[PDB]
Amino acid sequence: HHAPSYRVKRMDIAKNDEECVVNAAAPRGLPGDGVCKAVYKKWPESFKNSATPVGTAKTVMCGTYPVIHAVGPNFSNYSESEGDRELAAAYREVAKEVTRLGVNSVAIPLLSTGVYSGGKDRLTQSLNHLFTAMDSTDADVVIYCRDKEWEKKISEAIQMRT
């Protein structure tokens, strides 16, 4: 009867202490410069056939460690309304994969808030879609970020719901 939790840590997600990781991935499965740079350095084997459409997630094992490649929309290319829909959908697929995998915990970044943000601050938009998808799972969720002001805002959002 474990109590599922949310936490946020400001550090490289490749150093996570959870049972699986979510990559903020690209649709063609190519290595990138954000989270995906770290994921490719740490779990390169998980990039075999990791390509998957925008708005979806695809899990590839590195050994027995699952890497869930979730592809948020690039808001430079999508309208605000369609990009919002694809971002929500990518997180829904993450929740389904976390559940299917049976893991007790997952390390997760904020999708579409960096390289794919279209130059806008999307912390709240992305975090709220994360909660909408993950709230109904019972895995411990650890959100990884790099910006010190974002850490505070994410922490505040978590705490105000408890």
Ligand X SMILES: Nc1ncnc2c1ncn2[C@@H]1O[C@H](COP(=O)(O)OP(=O)(O)OC[C@H]2O[C@@H](O)[C@H](O)[C@@H]2O)[C@@H](O)[C@H]1O
118 touching ligand X, by CB under 6 A: no
Taking contact as CB under 6 A, which single stretch among the options 32-40, 47-55, 56-64, 78-86 is the one that binds ligand X?
32-40
Among 55, 117, 127, 139, binds ligand X (CB under 6 A): 117
Q: How far apart are the first and last CA of the chain?
A: 18
Close Cβ partners of 21 (under 8 Å, ≥ 6 residues apart): 13, 14, 39, 43, 65, 66, 67, 68, 106, 107, 108
- CB-facing half-sphere around the CA of 74: CA atoms within 13 A: 8
Look at residue 162 and give its three-state secondary structure: coil
Residue ranges in 55-74 that form contacts with ligand X under rule CB under 6 A: 72
36 touching ligand X, by CB under 6 A: yes
Which of 83/114 has CB closer to ligand X? Answer: 114
Among 20, 22, 38, 68, binds ligand X (CB under 6 A): 38
